[PDB]
Symmetry: D3
Subunit: 263 residues, 6 copies
């Protein structure tokens, strides 16, 4: 409510259905995440624990699109300051762990695009509803850095090592339909009904047994928690790459609209 949006600019809160706290986030184009939004999306889970009445959380990006991930501004801030780099490191860790350790089920209405941090948040949710034509991509390898913001924690237990290595190492995108087929996400529906179905799912969870749902989510999530070191190591390695020339060429290439010429 009021106490909360002021602290997290870019996040809007509403109750579309009884017990369903809907969080709408707004970034730059395709909801690219500026530093303030990244920090907000990673830290809000702390305070949400204090909100009474929440039986399910629904995540949605403003403008009918989820998120293309971290913005160029955020990336450049990270490369310019050690203090910023480490602050974002812990934010990146909580962007994934936040949803996982939140007591109530989290549903993500993944519209049109989910890349980098956007995909991290989409997959950190308990249930993700995507459109058959949604574009899902880790994207770090194209940028010149390791896939350390979620992939190593979540992908193996979602689609297995073969499909994970193929799509993470080659930067090969997945359509929402293909993603559901691999088991990366629970459902793939007509693009125009993504929000509709996600709300339906969220409402259904809000109708379920609160304590039993919390305990079940918590117990299942220990599977991910057992591999937290694996995840944090991938994140640390990714951040070590921020001072490397591969990231420099990756950004430069992306700005010059030319394929990267990695050294």
């Amino acid at each position: 409510l009021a106490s909360l949006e002021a602290r997290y600019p870019g996040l809007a809160f509403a109750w579309p259905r009884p017990g369903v706290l809907e969080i709408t986030f707004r970034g730059e184009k395709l909801n690219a995440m500026p530093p303030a939004l990244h920090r907000g999306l990673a830290r809000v889970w702390r305070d949400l624990e204090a909100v009474e009445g929440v039986r399910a959380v629904l995540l949605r990006g403003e403008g009918g699109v989820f998120s293309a991930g971290g913005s160029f501004g955020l990336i450049e801030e990270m490369r310019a300051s050690h203090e910023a780099l480490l602050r974002v490191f812990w934010e990146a860790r909580d962007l994934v762990l936040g949803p996982l350790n939140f007591p109530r089920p989290v549903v993500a209405a993944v519209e049109k695009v989910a890349v980098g941090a956007g995909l991290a948040l989409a997959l950190a949710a308990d249930i993700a509803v995507v459109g058959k034509g949604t574009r899902l991509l880790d994207g770090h390898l194209r940028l010149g850095v390791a896939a350390g913001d979620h992939a190593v924690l979540l992908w193996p237990l979602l689609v297995g090592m073969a499909k994970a290595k193929y799509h993470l190492l080659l930067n090969e995108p997945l359509t929402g339909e293909e993603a559901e087929r691999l088991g990366l996400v629970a459902l793939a529906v007509e693009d125009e009904k993504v929000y509709e179905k996600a709300l339906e799912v969220a409402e259904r969870l809000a109708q379920g047994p609160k304590e039993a749902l919390h305990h079940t989510k918590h117990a299942l999530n220990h599977w991910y928690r057992s591999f937290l070191p694996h995840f944090e190591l991938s994140l640390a390695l990714e951040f070590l790459g921020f001072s490397g020339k591969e990231l420099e060429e990756g950004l430069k290439a992306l700005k010059e609209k030319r394929p990267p010429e990695f050294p």
Copy 2:
């Protein structure tokens, strides 16, 4: 057989094929498990070790159906006394661990339905043969308690976390055909061919190399054993829920044939 059937009321033993020990269990309607059957299916594995000639075990529910899980009577016996609750706790643990630690391959002929403890037993088996129309459902969340009788030990390494969370948190049933495609079970055949195929598989295993099969099953099962604490925690959390208002509402709604209205 002789001494076994005497000590295990509800269980019938036979050798339909060479080296194939077939256990046919009988419960109530749809083979729902009363206290004695639940305990029997959980403890029989310890005594089967002494049965000479067993090269494979075939599990089948009497009357053309596997099992709808624990009966109302069992649930009532648990919630009524501490001593009964904890007795059932170890039984629930052994219902899954029993087949896993049994040296020989176990095949389950899953006909028509497998719910709750019924699904736990079916998925604890090394190879489950289901009918394309078989109904597979954890169903704990609908009852009002955490999915702690097998789901947390088995589902993640069977279908991945996305499909696990989707079907376990929402109590979304799976048909045999859909379950095979997700990787939850090995084969989904025509409904009237389930037993026939299951028997074929059991006989093939019985014709295989005993020591090699034992060692391969044993080695593969260490994957599950590495997550035993995860499993037991889920079970303990479920049982802690037996004294809550959610189970009271779920149990009441079920017997009363109406949708649950959780607090």
Copy 3:
């Protein structure tokens, strides 16, 4: 290198594309591996780290076929002396860990057949390209020994435990297309395009950020590394079976071209 070819008989080295080191191995029928080849394929990884300019490694069997695994000769040698059995134990371990611990991405062009050690190598690679008609089979249970040369380390996180147990315990072959559907491998293309597609993949990898690729592959492989004891145990158990009556019968039957009659 010119020195590598001399130290690794049976291995041919070439650079089909920039930064792509292609290793073509030659064995006996269907490239079955004799002692020298098995040892070379397991230990070459240690020396490749010294070859400058390697951004990706492409594996291919000579003659349009990957590998049917260890040769009859290798197996008999192992059964004949403790010295050879243990020498091969460490080679078998390295055949899988070599690729996994090699810094650069490894691609396998799996043509027509991949059995035993052949499948182990194909699956240890980061990305495997198979043909729709390729035949993949663990094969150990038919031979009379446990599936300990790779299956327990890689299969669970690739296709799940249900599909792993079905194909491993029954020795049920998979077509390349089926393997791709289960998640065992990334791509299944037309048989005549396997090499072509594999080379394309390797070239794409060679064009990516090498540090980012190394770190991503390394972080992901920790998932496999966490289960190394599980794997080495299965391997040890397999080798303990080399002095058993089951391998004797398994070998006798295969050579006599008759069904095995295990004790």
Copy 4:
């Protein structure tokens, strides 16, 4: 902080030295923890992250004594309702994880007595300074329930399994001096110098490298985090015992000041 003390009755905050935030807590006899205090000590860690300038935290019980653990009132409240039992479950979990997950080093001035939750808090701290005469005891087995509030997460990696089983299963108290020798705590000093030494330690920590300390503590604590399921299971089993006859007799015995007569 004033707001901080208002939300956590029983907790006093001060800055005895630069960067050293001292939290003094007060309970009942020997600082036994009432419901409000137990929850406060468990939940305060979340809000402490908001306090800037904290480089180290020093824990101390008021009145020259640390804590005898949960009070009779708290225990009875837990036995009286499911709602309270589960509320306290999550608090007990946080009482240990809170200090572990707090970024800054935590020092405990363990004076005279540390039992149950008191010991849990003292051992969850990064460094514990005890007095040669301080008395440390888990105490759950004498109470009639499993040692589930910290022992299974911390003791094994502190003193080894032999000493852990001996003191936990027999309820054999440890002097501060013996505890140091076993490795349960870092320092054991003259009773009169416990606070002095603890403050000295906290001050040294506050003078060290903030980021380096944070990261070192975090990396080391992953050792404990890897066994979280083990801990939570012990906690769940302990709580399942709250409805048993053993706890009944356990409390009856102490309140009547007579040796327990377990069934």
Copy 5:
């Protein structure tokens, strides 16, 4: 029980104290274990589960000595047959796992000497009482085989890796006094008081809360279970060495009372 004594040649059962089931085993000189005693001590745990009234188990070697481990006869039987070797493999596994998974606390009165399998059994017990002069030695390296019958499962979490590697790799004996100080065992008392004290401990445990003790032991033992693969691998490696020349030399030297001359 008459039935137990009838089925377990070499084992004597008695109730020296209420709820304390005492198992006195008799082998050859220094209770060296012949094939039947090894198997019996390994399998008895499965049958003890059905003995009503057991609240604690006390293990004692007949004739004032625990055990020097496996006899030359057992070692030769293992080296002479594949079937015998694998039979003993599972027995060796159960000798350690048996006590660990037995629900009630197990106390070992370790008099004078505990070597090899004798040490395995003593350390698998929950509480071991040794004499200050008792000799504790793994001894496998002297025999010419890997320390795989318990050391890899137990020692690291008892005394740390440095002391484990030192005493295991060098076959450096430990007196009971030195072992207690390292943390390998809980108590070291006057040699003549070992049984007396062990009985005292067993009686105290029998007077404790049954359910609470079971759950605490179970929860703590998950620490060991998490490393079951590690242990089984060490065991399998040890057994693969039985066909080697080092065991041949160690065995020959031992029987010829001379120092081994390893190849």
Copy 6:
């Protein structure tokens, strides 16, 4: 031999006793490690596997001193180049894993000083012999970076978490005598007897069973391998600190021999 001496400047090789390969390293004062020596000590293990006849490795620093760790030159090189930082990252990882994965037992004659990388090498060895007065110190917190070059992998399983956190977070040195008492090292002898005793230990190991020792070491080391992610994460966090102001001040204050004043 000649080929090794020719390839590793800074390292000297000799056979003081049959089967004992002694590696003496020479750095700057107190054998501080320049870039070349650090890489040499980290990579030599790969080539040592090729040397025939090695039954045990003995490590010793030239001039009667082990090593003060990385030299100022090495630290400055890391700080000034991303390329240098990451190359040392993998070297640091190998400095510890090299000895751990080497097949033969490794003994370290730790004379006078072992700090940073020096202590890492000393503790990675299977058996370390120190002098009663030897100074052992991690030392990273004093430098301003996390203790990530070995501590998080080795210390918990050597001395337990309490002693590890105390010495690592406070930068508190340990005398060889104290280190042995804690279990960090196997033996602490008179300073003058260090090399003599270390050689005696190495010789004894060379007289032991080669295969059995390899297998025992390998199996025990899986305890460390299971926590590799924990170790690498700590190493990565340490290296992320190289671009921070804490390291800058740590070096500055160090070179200016004044107490550091961290921000």
